[PDB]
């Protein structure tokens, strides 16, 4: 299983088996919470971390299962 990283610089699914047993999709808000919503910063992790204030972290363990609404197809 591989995870993508929107919080590094570009975005790419790299295998994260050393430590992170899976992936994680995070969301929150950028410089100014635009009307478009938050962002989509997923990546790798050992377990869906952060879950007390408002951080909406998520998880995903599958062939690049961190695809967010990026290239709106159609």
């Amino acid at each position: 299983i591989v995870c993508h990283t929107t919080a590094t610089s570009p975005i790419s699914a790299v295998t994260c088996p050393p430590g992170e047993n899976l992936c994680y999709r995070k969301m929150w808000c950028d410089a100014f919470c635009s009307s478009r919503g938050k962002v989509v910063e997923l990546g790798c992790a050992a377990t869906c971390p952060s879950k007390k204030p408002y951080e909406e972290v998520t998880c995903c363990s599958t062939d690049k299962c961190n695809p967010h609404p990026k290239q709106r197809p159609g």
Partner: peptide
């Protein structure tokens, strides 16, 4: 310039 929840082309505006 974000992989927001509705775009993937570093859109400025």
């Amino acid at each position: 310039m974000r992989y927001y929840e509705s775009s993937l082309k570093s859109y400025p505006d």
